[PDB]
Structure formats: structure tokens, C-alpha cells
Amino acid sequence: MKKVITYGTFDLLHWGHIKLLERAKQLGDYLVVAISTDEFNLQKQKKAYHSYEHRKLILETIRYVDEVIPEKNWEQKKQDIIDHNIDVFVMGDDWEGKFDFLKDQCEVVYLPRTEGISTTKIKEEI
Amino acid sequence: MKKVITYGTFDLLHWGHIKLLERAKQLGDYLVVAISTDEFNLQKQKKAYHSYEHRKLILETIRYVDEVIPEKNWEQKKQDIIDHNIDVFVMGDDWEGKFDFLKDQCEVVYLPRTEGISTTKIKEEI
Numbered sequence: 001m002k003k004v005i006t007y008g009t010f011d012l013l014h015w016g017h018i019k020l021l022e023r024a025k026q027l028g029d030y031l032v033v034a035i036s037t038d039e040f041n042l043q044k045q046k047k048a049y050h051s052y053e054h055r056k057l058i059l060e061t062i063r064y065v066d067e068v069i070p071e072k073n074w075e076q077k078k079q080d081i082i083d084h085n086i087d088v089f090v091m092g093d094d095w096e097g098k099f100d101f102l103k104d105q106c107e108v109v110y111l112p113r114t115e116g117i118s119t120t121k122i123k124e125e126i
Numbered sequence: 127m128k129k130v131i132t133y134g135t136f137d138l139l140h141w142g143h144i145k146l147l148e149r150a151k152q153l154g155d156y157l158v159v160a161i162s163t164d165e166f167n168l169q170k171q172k173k174a175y176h177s178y179e180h181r182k183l184i185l186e187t188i189r190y191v192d193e194v195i196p197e198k199n200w201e202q203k204k205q206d207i208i209d210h211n212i213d214v215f216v217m218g219d220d221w222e223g224k225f226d227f228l229k230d231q232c233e234v235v236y237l238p239r240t241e242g243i244s245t246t247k248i249k250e251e252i
């Protein structure tokens with residue numbers, strides 16, 4: 001079984017998020033999404049409209065998502081790859097090159113973001 | 127096959143929408159969701175943040191949803207029930223009694239809304 005992992009907040013779920021999940025899932029057989037907890041968001045001074053419990057709840061109903069785990073800090077990535085036996089690590093290309101140190105443990109793939117949509121723009125346009 | 131139908135806008139998808147979809151699906155084997163088109167929304171003077179195409183796209187990825195059709199006007203309900211061979215019609219209880227005339231064609235069920243969450247509150251709190 002080829003396991004894939006990706007990290008993010010997924011606060012006001014939009015089509016850009018969906019396209020990412022779609023493409024990440026097609027890189028394996030099982031997709032795990034690690035999402036920022038509310039404590040971690042506070043550390044990043046990036047408050048999410050929806051709580052961790054609600055963001056997880058909604059993510060768990062998306063066809064592409066197999067499992068959702070909490071992202072509590074910046075450092076947990078290497079152990080997650082080990083703990084969950086991850087074969088593919090996927091991130092948006094705005095992180096291009098940042099996680100190349102994980103390549104000795106799994107395949108690292110940077111997918112281009114979907115243009116014209118993001119959670120802050122939604123908030124700014126409201 | 128017991129088919130279910132429900133109508134709505136499903137603009138900024140939240141846990142209240144998810145719980146409705148979950149409960150509606152458990153009333154049958156197949157769930158069809160009719161969502162307001164942007165033209166109908168203009169007619170209702172209730173503009174959605176996300177377009178019809180993006181609202182449909184996101185709804186189609188929810189595990190509970192089997193099919194998504196366009197809701198173009200207020201009068202289409204009886205023909206939809208005929209056209210899609212609907213057995214169960216589900217609406218929020220805030221519509222309790224408004225569609226009781228469809229009872230000679232199928233079962234009509236009003237489910238209680240989820241408290242503390244709605245698309246306007248999200249918009250108001252942003």
C-alpha cells in the first residue's frame with residue numbers, strides 16, 4: 001500500500017483545496033492529511049475560522065481523504081513519515097525545496113497551487 | 127433503490143451542512159442534492175461566495191452525495207421528484223409544512239438544523 005501525506009490548515013474548504021487532495025490521492029492508495037491544531041495555529045498567529053474538530057470532521061467526508069491526524073508543531077514531519085509508513089510526501093510548490101531533506105525516506109512531490117483562490121482572499125473578500 | 131433529494135445553496139460548506147447530508151443519506155440508498163444556480167441566486171438576491179460550478183464540484187466529493195443537479199426556480203420540485211424517481215424528500219425543519227403537498231408522491235421529512243452555525247453567521251463573523 002502506497003501511503004501519501006500532506007499538511008495544511010484547510011479552514012474555509014474551497015476548490016483549490018479539493019484539487020490538491022485529488023492530485024495527492026492519485027499519487028498513492030491511501031491519503032493521510034495532517035491539519036494544524038488550534039494551539040499550533042495560535043503559535044503561527046494564524047487563527048482559523050473553523051475549529052480543529054470541525055475542520056477534521058469536514059475533511060473526513062471528502063472521498064479522497066483516508067485519515068486525518070493533528071499537526072502540532074513544525075518538527076513532527078520526519079517522525080510522521082516513520083510512524084505512518086509514508087511513501088509519498090506532498091506539499092504545494094510554494095514550499096519547493098524546503099522539505100527536500102525527507103527524500104532519503106520517501107518521495108517528495110510539490111504540486112502547483114490552484115490560481116485565483118485561497119482562504120485569505122475569501123476572508124478579505126468578505 | 128430508495129432515492130433521496132434535498133435542496134440548498136451549500137455556499138461556505140460547514141459542519142451543519144455535513145450533518146444534514148449525513149442524516150439525509152441515511153434515509154435512503156442514493157442522495158441527490160439540488161443546489162441553487164447563480165441565476166436563481168440573483169433572482170433571490172442572495173449572492174453566494176462560491177460559484178455554482180465550484181459549489182457543485184465540492185459537493186460531489188462528499189461521501190454522502192451521489193448526484194448534484196441544478197435548482198433553477200421554486201416550481202421545479204414536483205417534476206424533480208418525478209424525473210429522478212425520488213422516494214424521500216428532505217428539508218430543514220425551517221421549511222416545516224411548506225412542502226407537505228409532495229406527500230402524495232413521496233415521503234417528506236424535515237430534519238432539525240444544526241445549532242450555532244450557518245453561512246450568514248460565517249460571513250457576518252468575517
Ligand SMILES: Nc1ccn([C@@H]2O[C@H](COP(=O)(O)OP(=O)(O)OP(=O)(O)O)[C@@H](O)[C@H]2O)c(=O)n1
Binds near residue numbers: 011017092115117120
Ligand atoms: N489555491 C490553492 C490554495 C491552497 N492549496 C493547497 O492547499 C494546501 C493546504 O491548504 P491551505 O494552506 O490551508 O489553503 P490556503 O488557501 O493556501 O490558506 P491561506 O490563504 O490562509 O494561506 C497547500 O498544500 C496549498 O498549496 C492549493 O493548492 N491551491
Ligand SMILES: Nc1ccn([C@@H]2O[C@H](COP(=O)(O)OP(=O)(O)OP(=O)(O)O)[C@@H](O)[C@H]2O)c(=O)n1
Binds near residue numbers: 239
Ligand atoms: N446550521 C445549519 C445550516 C444549514 N442546515 C441545512 O442545510 C440545508 C441547506 O443549506 P444552506 O441553507 O445553504 O446553509 P445555511 O447555513 O442555512 O445558509 P444561510 O445562512 O445563507 O441560509 C438546509 O436544509 C438547512 O436546514 C442545517 O441543517 N444546519
